[PDB]
Amino acid sequence: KKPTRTLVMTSMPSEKQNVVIQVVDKLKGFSIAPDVCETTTHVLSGKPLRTLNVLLGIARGCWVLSYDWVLWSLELGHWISEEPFELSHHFPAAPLCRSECHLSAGPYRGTLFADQPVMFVSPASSPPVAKLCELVHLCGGRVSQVPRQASIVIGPYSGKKKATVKYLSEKWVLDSITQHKVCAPENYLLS
């Protein structure tokens, strides 16, 4: 055998899904994972939307392309160049992490949240906490299992608020990932 790298599909109608599976079957060279993981190198969107799988792809520096790249890859009979079809306009961070991952010295880990405090992610947050903690780690940030260690809290938090802590929304994390820019914390405050 099975090709190691994996090709994931998001916002992808079923009629389009079968086409992809079948271009992978004829052209070989990939394995299809249901979710972006360690092996994923390419992510294909049917409709450019910010799904869990597009966020994660941006964190890993994967190619994030339009369904077009498959159509033409089929018409030609080989995996063509990815660059012409990656969704720069919708996710301006993708092209940055993509290039950054391919010129990486050692293995690739984002540096985005590296100069940030330790964050605690609440379990009752949406998206799910497991994937949203993963996002923060993949991007450079460090997460804590208990709030007392964290200087930043993320998501629904009922407990006594803390003056030495900034309590923010999830979209602060997500928007910083999409813009490849640590957004201003003062306009992502969760109250």
Binding site: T10, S11, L49, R50, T51, L52, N53, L55, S126, P127, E170, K171, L174
Partner: peptide
Amino acid sequence: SDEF
């Protein structure tokens, strides 16, 4: 797949 939920958007975010």
